[PDB]
Amino acid sequence: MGKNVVVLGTQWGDEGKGKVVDLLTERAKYVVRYQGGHNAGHTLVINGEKTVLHLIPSGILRENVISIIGNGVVLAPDALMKEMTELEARGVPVRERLLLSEACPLILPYHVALDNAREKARGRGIGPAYEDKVARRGLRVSDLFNKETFAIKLKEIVEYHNFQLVHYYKEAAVDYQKVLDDVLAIADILTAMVVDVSELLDNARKQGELIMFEGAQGTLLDIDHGTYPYVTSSNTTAGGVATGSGLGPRYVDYVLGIVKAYSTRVGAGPFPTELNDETGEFLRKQGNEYGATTGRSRRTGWLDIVAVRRAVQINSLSGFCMTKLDVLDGLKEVKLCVGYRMPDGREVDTTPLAAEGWEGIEPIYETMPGWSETTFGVKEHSKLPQAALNYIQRVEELTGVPIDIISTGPDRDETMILRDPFDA
Amino acid sequence: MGKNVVVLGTQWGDEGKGKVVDLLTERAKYVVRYQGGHNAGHTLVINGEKTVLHLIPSGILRENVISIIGNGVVLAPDALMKEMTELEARGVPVRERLLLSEACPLILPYHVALDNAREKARGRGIGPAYEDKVARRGLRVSDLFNKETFAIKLKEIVEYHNFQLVHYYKEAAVDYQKVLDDVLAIADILTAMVVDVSELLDNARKQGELIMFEGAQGTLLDIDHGTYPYVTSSNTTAGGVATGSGLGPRYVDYVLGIVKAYSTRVGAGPFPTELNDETGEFLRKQGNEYGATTGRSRRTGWLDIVAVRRAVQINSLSGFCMTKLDVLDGLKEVKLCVGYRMPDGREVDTTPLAAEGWEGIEPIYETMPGWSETTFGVKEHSKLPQAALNYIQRVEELTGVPIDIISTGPDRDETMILRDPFDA
Numbered sequence: 124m125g126k127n128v129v130v131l132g133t134q135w136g137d138e139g140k141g142k143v144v145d146l147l148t149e150r151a152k153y154v155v156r157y158q159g160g161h162n163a164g165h166t167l168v169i170n171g172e173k174t175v176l177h178l179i180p181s182g183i184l185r186e187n188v189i190s191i192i193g194n195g196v197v198l199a200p201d202a203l204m205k206e207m208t209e210l211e212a213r214g215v216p217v218r219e220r221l222l223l224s225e226a227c228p229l230i231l232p233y234h235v236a237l238d239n240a241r242e243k244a245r246g247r248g249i250g251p252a253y254e255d256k257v258a259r260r261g262l263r264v265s266d267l268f269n270k271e272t273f274a275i276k277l278k279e280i281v282e283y284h285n286f287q288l289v290h291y292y293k294e295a296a297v298d299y300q301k302v303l304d305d306v307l308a309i310a311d312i313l314t315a316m317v318v319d320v321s322e323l324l325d326n327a328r329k330q331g332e333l334i335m336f337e338g339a340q341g342t343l344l345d346i347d348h349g350t351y352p353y354v355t356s357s358n359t360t361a362g363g364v365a366t367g368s369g370l371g372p373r374y375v376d377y378v379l380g381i382v383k384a385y386s387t388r389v390g391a392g393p394f395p396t397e398l399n400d401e402t403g404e405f406l407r408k409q410g411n412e413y414g415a416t417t418g419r420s421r422r423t424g425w426l427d428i429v430a431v432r433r434a435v436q437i438n439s440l441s442g443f444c445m446t447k448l449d450v451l452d453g454l455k456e457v458k459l460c461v462g463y464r465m466p467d468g469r470e471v472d473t474t475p476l477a478a479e480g481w482e483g484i485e486p487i488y489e490t491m492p493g494w495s496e497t498t499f500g501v502k503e504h505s506k507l508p509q510a511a512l513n514y515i516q517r518v519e520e521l522t523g524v525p526i527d528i529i530s531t532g533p534d535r536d537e538t539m540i541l542r543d544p545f546d547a
Numbered sequence: 548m549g550k551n552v553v554v555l556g557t558q559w560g561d562e563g564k565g566k567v568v569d570l571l572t573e574r575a576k577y578v579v580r581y582q583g584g585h586n587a588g589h590t591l592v593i594n595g596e597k598t599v600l601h602l603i604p605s606g607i608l609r610e611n612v613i614s615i616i617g618n619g620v621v622l623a624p625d626a627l628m629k630e631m632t633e634l635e636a637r638g639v640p641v642r643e644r645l646l647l648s649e650a651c652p653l654i655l656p657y658h659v660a661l662d663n664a665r666e667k668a669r670g671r672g673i674g675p676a677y678e679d680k681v682a683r684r685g686l687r688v689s690d691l692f693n694k695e696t697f698a699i700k701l702k703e704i705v706e707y708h709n710f711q712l713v714h715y716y717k718e719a720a721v722d723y724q725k726v727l728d729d730v731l732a733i734a735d736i737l738t739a740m741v742v743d744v745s746e747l748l749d750n751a752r753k754q755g756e757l758i759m760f761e762g763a764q765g766t767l768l769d770i771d772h773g774t775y776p777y778v779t780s781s782n783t784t785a786g787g788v789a790t791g792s793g794l795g796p797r798y799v800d801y802v803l804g805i806v807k808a809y810s811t812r813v814g815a816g817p818f819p820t821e822l823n824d825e826t827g828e829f830l831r832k833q834g835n836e837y838g839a840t841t842g843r844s845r846r847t848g849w850l851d852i853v854a855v856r857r858a859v860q861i862n863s864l865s866g867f868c869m870t871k872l873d874v875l876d877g878l879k880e881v882k883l884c885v886g887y888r889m890p891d892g893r894e895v896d897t898t899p900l901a902a903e904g905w906e907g908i909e910p911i912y913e914t915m916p917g918w919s920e921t922t923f924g925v926k927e928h929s930k931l932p933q934a935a936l937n938y939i940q941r942v943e944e945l946t947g948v949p950i951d952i953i954s955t956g957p958d959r960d961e962t963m964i965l966r967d968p969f970d971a
Binding site for chain 1: 553618619649650675677678680681682683687688689692710711714715738741743745746749769770773774775776778780781782784785786787788789790791793794795796797798799803857860861862864865897900901902903908915
């Protein structure tokens with residue numbers, strides 16, 4: 124009997140998780156998303172054909188695998204329908220393969236309105252949906268099973284948020300009836316996918332099946348443990364799997380940290396190893412880190428072992444998959460940040476508390492030879508350049524965590540699984 | 548090397564957890580609260596002397612034990628200071644023994660204002676504090692380390708909530724300066740208690756020390772998995788331990804479910820085994836279930852094995868501690884609810900989805916002999932009445948989970964630890 128595997132990003136997002144979940148599902152019976160919303164941006168490339176997923180889990184392209192959107196995921200019905208319809212217009216029989224938790228909150232248009240108004244005052248609507256959830260004033264998939272009381276609950280919530288939208292934000296009121304109409308048009312599609320996820324997952328273990336759990340975003344964006352206030356609206360660590368799916372918490376068997384070979388952040392927040400130079404532009408170009416829209420070009424920098432150590436700790440990582448190793452190809456030297464020099468001159472090897480702050484940190488690096496022979500194109504471990512093998516080894520040494528999977532390109536086949544994480 | 552132990556309520560609260568955490572700490576090095584606020588109501592009786600704790604963890608009366616308020620706990624500074632000062636006026640050197648996470652949100656008076664206004668429209672301020680947390684608009688202990696920027700952040704948040712309080716709720720504006728003044732008077736006391744909790748807990752495992760985690764409230768009040776919408780503002784299951792403390796999620800070693808020998812709920816929500824008869828009043832009297840204020844007299848009912856099975860599943864319980872067994876003393880017969888008869892006549896042994904609803908359930912009982920010889924006064928397992936031993940056995944059989952600890956009164960010594968949960 125093997126181990127459930129939780130796959131999550133160890134850094135500040137964009138670690139290249141989608142590819143890894145898809146490659147590893149081939150084995151699994153269930154793939155379960157357990158937190159966040161429709162902003163995963165998880166990219167699969169199979170025989171050169173690209174798929175992008177934001178909401179639907181990254182096992183959806185695999186036969187005989189059941190994908191589940193667990194309760195920890197906030198669900199925009201319009202977004203789910205769009206992804207469903209587009210996968211379906213391709214070969215992918217989504218409705219055969221996809222189940223939903225009744226406990227998923229609904230993201231509706233007033234959440235998008237609130238989110239935008241808030242941002243102006245300085246995957247849309249995710250935060251406001253989580254907020255309504257905490258207040259127990261929101262809606263869930265479970266509310267769709269009685270359309271009459273759904274309408275009554277919806278009217279109350281729309282009225283509530285319209286007060287703020289109109290009087291505080293000076294924005295247009297959201298039209299209750301339009302919101303209702305659009306939900307009613309698709310309600311039966313969503314309710315047909317509902318199952319008792321807790322019971323399914325319990326039974327799965329007893330049946331000898333293993334579960335893959337898919338996280339989005341990145342460990343150091345975790346609402347509690349990340350770089351506060353530059354964090355997201357939910358927990359992103361492996362500790363969310365139980366509460367976000369109904370899995371019993373003793374059954375978090377193996378935690379696979381996806382660690383990109385270099386660092387990125389999108390938007391503001393502390394970033395000790397940030398490179399605002401030609402090396403940084405090289406990483407951005409070679410790693411295709413420009414994003415999709417204004418202001419979402421990723422900041423780039425060297426791999427930060429101090430920060431990664433924090434992710435090892437809060438996730439209890441079992442092993443790593445290192446991604447995008449090929450991006451470093453050709454660099455004369457590569458660097459690992461192994462310590463932080465604080466403004467007072469102290470040298471530390473642990474991330475600072477928000478109490479102290481990240482301001483003014485100087486990274487302390489180990490510099491190592493790069494490789495001119497490529498890792499791109501490599502599918503046999505013994506054919507990796509020795510300097511790349513050494514880089515990998517050094518990260519293992521510094522973290523105490525093995526690199527069990529190495530990725531050298533975007534395709535499912537540009538990968539070496541040294542130890543399959545499902546093993547007993 | 549033994550097992551970290553998570554102690555939590557398996558039902559709808561008031562399971563009698565405080566006593567169990569205190570009895571079991573005697574062994575532990577750390578005791579960690581990981582969710583909720585200052586409404587735990589955890590009651591300790593040691594050599595006949597009562598202590599009530601709402602916020603401070605239930606290990607605080609034990610020497611050589613370090614108590615920690617982890618990040619998942621929302622913290623009202625006034626409440627912490629009051630509990631501290633009162634324990635300290637007794638023998639208890641709180642400040643020697645108590646650490647705080649910098650990531651604890653602060654509950655401030657505007658949260659109390661919002662909470663009350665909301666309730667009118669139909670442990671104060673807990674929900675609104677969790678809501679501000681999700682929005683990343685709130686304050687944390689970490690914000691107290693710069694008093695100048697604390698003031699700026701506080702002004703913004705007070706202004707924001709005052710708009711709603713004044714214009715929507717028609718209540719008085721909260722006085723920013725008074726809120727500030729009261730926080731500044733005690734800030735240094737709180738910041739002095741801050742430690743890197745994640746690092747401490749990681750090191751503790753490696754050091755060979757074990758950790759006790761204390762939950763509040765009850766499993767079926769869990770925001771996701773409980774009886775929605777009759778649930779609390781946070782997760783209450785064992786799956787919150789990792790995110791609420793920084794413990795690595797693979798290190799949830801043993802989960803001890805506190806299960807009261809009969810059922811209670813406070814306030815509204817589904818309750819299949821509810822007894823609105825003389826048996827119910829007997830349980831209320833003998834179990835001291837009247838609460839402390841208007842509207843908090845507990846509804847009482849028989850032990851509900853269908854519901855407890857749900858708690859076994861979502862918590863992955865390792866074992867039970869059965870509490871308040873003595874309350875049943877003298878009943879001619881006792882009952883266990885082993886199934887639910889739905890309004891359509893189907894008989895099921897799993898809790899219904901919110902999608903289906905709990906309306907109209909008829910409990911299906913096993914009826915068993917009670918005991919006239921008391922369990923009260925019993926401290927040797929072989930001296931329990933056989934009918935009580937049989938009741939215990941039957942709950943084990945129905946749930947598949949052993950009853951490892953039996954409690955027969957409120958005192959620390961009115962207990963039989965059959966298997967200590969810390970064992971490897």
